[PDB]
Design a protein around this ligand. Sequence first.
Ligand code: CPZ
Length: 367
Amino acid sequence: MYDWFSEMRKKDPVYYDGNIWQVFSYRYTKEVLNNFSKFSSDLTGYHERLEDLRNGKIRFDIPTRYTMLTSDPPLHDELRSMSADIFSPQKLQTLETFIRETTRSLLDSIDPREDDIVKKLAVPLPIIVISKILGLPIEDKEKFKEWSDLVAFRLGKPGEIFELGKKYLELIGYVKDHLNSGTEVVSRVVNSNLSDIEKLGYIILLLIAGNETTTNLISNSVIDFTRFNLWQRIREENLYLKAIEEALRYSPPVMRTVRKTKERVKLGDQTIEEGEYVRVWIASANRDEEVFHDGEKFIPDRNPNPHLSFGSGIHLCLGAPLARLEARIAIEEFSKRFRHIEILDTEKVPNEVLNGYKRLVVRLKSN
Ligand SMILES: Clc1ccc(-c2cnc[nH]2)cc1
């Protein structure tokens, strides 16, 4: 992948394949993400359907089509404003102790002789934490990890990131069943003037959408630190913060995102018609030499690091403070807990947008 990025960055940073457009350079990627008025996120007809959702003309639909993720201002701002305080670093700092108790308790369950740290650490941690934040009880651990696995690029349902079917209907059942027992954020949404369909989409989004991505951040960090042999240095020079950011830049859990043009617009030398999809390659932009010196090297204390792995502009990941925090703690406790790590086996997440590991088998010595 990355060498193709490197080539496209040289020869067409903005590229039409006869179907859609694809952007590879940092400058044009950031331009696209921030120009919400020409590059829309409304890929699921949320705005056009909003009124009929609220007045009940629309009786049945896929709840996760209608969230802040697939909306433009003002609807987007109004939706996000309901939970932005909760996911701020100031408000999350309360959780540090809980996140840390949880982490070390998850480290305990690990067999240093041989274990899968995706299964033991990286998967359960984001799930335990978001459950705590939302007041939504992990009743069945297996259901929750299965629900988390529904999150995927969907060709070609362009706004959609949830696989449907019986497991999805189970998730809807679960959420209807716990609406009223939730923490205050859930109460905000439940008591709002949103349609029930939107209420479901909103909760499901917060509950589930961030699990695998955060899990991937943790896994990719473990991989990158091990391969490039930085564990000691990170621990000794205390580089956690900047290292995690370099992980995010180098191994982004979300490889790319997409927009649709609201009007004919100009990007670089190219002219993009209206109604065209524009795929924006975060992973490629994160290695643009114009912005990142030695962009193909992993510098654990890289600075500056204005990477795009949480996006840019009004859609800048709501979970970024949370993901950074969980990851920071996970790594810290991990690097303190073990001295030696060898990688026995890996199985990658196999699809196109999500970038991480289904299995990461290690041998660690105990400390
Ligand atoms: Cl295909 C896809 C894209 C983005 C996400 C995401 C961003 N923030 C949380 N989840 C999940 C799945």
